[PDB]
Structures are given as structure tokens and as C-alpha cells.
Design a binder for this molecule. Sequence first.
Ligand SMILES: Nc1ncnc2c1ncn2[C@@H]1O[C@H](COP(=O)(O)O)[C@@H](O)[C@H]1O
Length: 287
Amino acid sequence: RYRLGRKIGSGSFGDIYLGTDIAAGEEVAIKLECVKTKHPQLHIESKIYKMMQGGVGIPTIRWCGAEGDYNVMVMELLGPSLEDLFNFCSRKFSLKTVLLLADQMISRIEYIHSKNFIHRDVKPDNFLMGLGKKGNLVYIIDFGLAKKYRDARTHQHIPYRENKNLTGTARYASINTHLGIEQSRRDDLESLGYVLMYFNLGSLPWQGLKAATKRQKYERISEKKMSTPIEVLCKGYPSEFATYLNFCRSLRFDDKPDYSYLRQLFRNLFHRQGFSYDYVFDWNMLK
Ligand SMILES: Nc1ncnc2c1ncn2[C@@H]1O[C@H](COP(=O)(O)O)[C@@H](O)[C@H]1O
């Protein structure tokens, strides 16, 4: 039912192609999982996307099972990542673009939380703009590290746990993630806070820090992050950014975040600046 076109991306558990859904007559993205291992990841990712179906800015998927030496997931075809678009804008976004993005990104994370998952990989690479009719819509992708933080029926929160190892990308990790604490809803939002200040600054002060051979590879990132006050990180930017990060850092392990407070904080700033909620992003002005 599918025709595979040109490769458009590579991921930790396989590659993303342009494809045709022959029955639907629509162009789609097709994720192929080649190396299964004993614990293949694509079928699990598809099951999390199924529980997120009906979410705005969550790609619609079709689990297709095996073909030859591949597992197949057909996805809504999306546009450039926010990391790609940041590079295209010379690694500066206007305050207006950062606030337009913040408004959607809080809502996307809230939606995932509402379906009893935490994302745990919040970074600009994993937010993609839509194409065509959905060009103004921020999507979130990559549920490869996503976890249930509560039972689907009980809403009994996962237990507190420490002594965990940090794996993958630390640039946007929460301070508690550096400290080996179990991730929960607060950590996704603290990560988003570092993403927003990254868009403001062009980089983060701990970005690209390398440890000595033999040392834990993240120790220089962790030390800089913990020794950089929020007020120093956010110096020269509207107070709302510091307010956002202080609020996230204050949340207890099992606390339900006040998403509406964080959105309204940025909305009030948007109004004080006299910005129009027009979805005219910096990249729309590129010539
Ligand atoms: N549905 C999609 N539409 C377009 N590009 C995608 C899609 N999913 C993933 N990508 C791209 O594929 C690469 C790896 O994505 P992933 O490994 O699935 O997180 C990155 O360059 C993403 O921007």
C-alpha cells in the first residue's frame, strides 16, 4: 500500500523516508527500523503515538508491522525542526517568535502529560513545524524515551527514585536529571525553559563542555548548569523567562504543573510588547 521515496532523516533506531500512501493518495513519512535488537523500539513508539491520537501538533501514524528485514511506521509528513529553522535564522529568534513558539510548546507538553506520559527528550531537534496548511503548527516528535508517569486507570504517580544515570543529550536536561532523580512532568517543562533561553541567547553557557577522559562525560555540563543562577542565565531578557524557570525548578516530584500560569505569563508579556498573534515567524521573512 506504500511506495518508499528518498531518505529525509536518520534516528537512533532507524531512518525516515518520503513515501506515498497509494490507498489515501497522500505523501507521508515512513520510519524503517532495520536493526531490531532483542528490544525493538519502533512498535513501542507507535503504541505511544496511538494513545496521543487526536492531539493537535502530534503526528498521526499507521503501525504497518514488518516488511522483510524492517519494521514500518507511516507518519504524517512534517516540515523543518526548530533547530534547523534556528540555524536558518542565523541562531537568533526575535522575542515575538520565541513567545509564539512558547505558547504552542507548553500546550504540546501539557497534552502529552494529559495522556499520562512524559516525553523526556525536550529539545529543538524534536519540535518540527508543519507543512502546507499546517505551516503555523508546532509538532512534537520522537517518543523513543517517553515513559508513563502514572497508571492510565489509577493516575497513581510513579515512585520517587534516585541514583539513575543520565543518557543521551544533556544540553537541555533538568538539574534534577543531572542529579540522577527520576524524571517527571516538571523536568519536561524545565527543559522547555532551557530551549526558550537557547533561542534567546543563541547557545547556552554549558553548551559543548567536555570532561577529561576517564571522567563521567556530563560532569562539566552539570557543574556549569548548577553554578549558573537562573538570574545570570536570563540577565537582559524579560523577567518572565526567569519566572518560568524558577517555577519549574520549584515543582515537587509528583506535582501537576500549572501550564495555564506559564502560558498566561508569556501572553501578558506578548501583550505588553504590543505583538500581534499572527503566526508571522522570523523564518517567514527570509528572502
Ligand atoms: N514525520 C516526520 N516528517 C518529517 N521529518 C521527520 C519526521 N519524523 C522525523 N523526521 C526527521 O527525521 C530525522 C530523525 O527523526 P527521529 O529519529 O524519528 O526523531 C530528523 O531529521 C527529523 O527532523
